[PDB]
Amino acid sequence: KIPRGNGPYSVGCTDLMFDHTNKGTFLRLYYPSQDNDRLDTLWIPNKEYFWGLSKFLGTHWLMGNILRLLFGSMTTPANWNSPLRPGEKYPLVVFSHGLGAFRTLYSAIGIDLASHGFIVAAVEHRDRSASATYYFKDQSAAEIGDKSWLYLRTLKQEEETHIRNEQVRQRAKECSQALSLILDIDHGKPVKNALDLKFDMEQLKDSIDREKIAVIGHSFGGATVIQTLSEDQRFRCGIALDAWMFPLGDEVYSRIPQPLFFINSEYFQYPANIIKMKKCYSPDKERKMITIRGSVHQNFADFTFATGKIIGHMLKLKGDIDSNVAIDLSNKASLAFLQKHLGLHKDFDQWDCLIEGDDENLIPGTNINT
């Protein structure tokens, strides 16, 4: 089970696609809800995501059908299409998923933030870094629900530098576009969701705390954080979860004025990647880094909760550290950082010492020597 949020608010979830095209925005929204008696949210909601994950793993497409069978009915503890909790303006996180992932696979993070009173927009990227995604060829197709699928692109070694950088720039643009869509919905523009879901977007009107915007992401999503910050000053801080720095151009490093927080796993990181992170540091800029002891790259994504302890450790979905323990540390430290740099008046400053890695399961900075 993906854990429930630790915060006081109940949590809702819905999908938004606008426009309907491959250049439109597609995101999963997690938000504070009133109602707690709705059906839980289907975790991986289409069979084509399993086909996607199979290609991503480099296995026979039929392995996809087996993944579906195992995980296809699994839910995540968010009330599907619940009404938004009214009467308060919520800060906004835009969340960027990793390579081979998609929008639904960071619900532990998204649910927890929402339970503390954030609205989380987990984008689905159309850069072919997602295992799968979908969109509609034109208006007719969107009405009848005729989905077109776009699958992960496998690169040759000689495309890697160029293409990963093209993708990270597109990802940043998709983050910025998602932000503008949400802010517009906040500013009351009618938007016809391309998905026919029973969630009236008009509830979102005047529900966003417009200047309290942050961007968060895992791995490829962590680079996306950094690109996004250096492209859109509307984002006031970033949190990179085990950032994979390779996609970034040499230009961006000196070009990130906003506070930035690296939350790393113990076993993923390596000198080349750490050196690139330290290239973001300048005396005039706010930068924090912590390393979660006994953790692996996958501790930040939902599949760390989807299998048993033994199978999970074997597949490097789980580390030596308990997955709930690990994600609690990442989430609580994130909340403290956000409160600090968005100027929130909540109680997240109780976790301030975790930003400093002052905990028996944290390492201040990094374990990697460079």
Ligand SMILES: CC1([C@@H]2CC(=O)N(CCOc3ccc(F)c(C#N)c3)C2)CCS(=O)(=O)CC1
């Ligand atoms: C570093 C990396 C990728 C970059 C990235 O973003 N990574 C996270 C993927 O996280 C995922 C992927 C699918 C999932 F289903 C879930 C879930 N839950 C999480 C790992 C590219 C370079 S490499 O090939 O040498 C080694 C791997």
Ligand SMILES: [Cl-]
């Ligand atoms: Cl290295």
Ligand code: NA
């Ligand atoms: Na911009």
